[PDB]
Amino acid sequence: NEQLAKQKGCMACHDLKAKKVGPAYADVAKKYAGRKDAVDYLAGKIKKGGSGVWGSVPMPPQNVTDAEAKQLAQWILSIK
Numbered sequence: 456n457e458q459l460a461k462q463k464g465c466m467a468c469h470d471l472k473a474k475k476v477g478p479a480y481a482d483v484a485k486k487y488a489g490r491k492d493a494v495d496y497l498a499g500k501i502k503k504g505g506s507g508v509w510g511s512v513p514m515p516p517q518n519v520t521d522a523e524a525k526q527l528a529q530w531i532l533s534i535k
């Protein structure tokens with residue numbers, strides 16, 4: 456929803472249409488669509504991190520469960 460992206464700290468480097476540090480959620484959903492692994496793939500870089508798709512900025516790992524992480528990839532996609 457929204458309170459799940461604040462208490463955690465994902466909005467720190469993200470935002471619907473507020474290009475700041477990380478890739479705004481909106482842009483993240485546009486990068487994928489119809490993929491058969493957009494949930495495991497996204498949530499994958501969510502519970503681990505990495506870089507190379509948005510530049511060289513190496514994103515840090517996060518401490519989230521595969522459940523809330525799955526809701527962040529399914530919710531981020533539902534966002535235009």
Ligand code: HEC
Nearest residue numbers: 463464465467468477500501506507508509510512514517
């Ligand atoms: C800044 C210190 C960040 C914090 C804190 C979080 N994320 Fe992040 N995220 C960041 C960057 C720089 C990137 C892009 C990697 C790069 O090339 O630099 C990302 C990317 C994501 C993605 C998409 C990755 C993909 O497969 O394209 C997701 C889904 C994502 N981030 C989720 C996420 C969540 C849930 C966070 C809170 C726990 C979070 N990020 C924090 C930078 C930063």
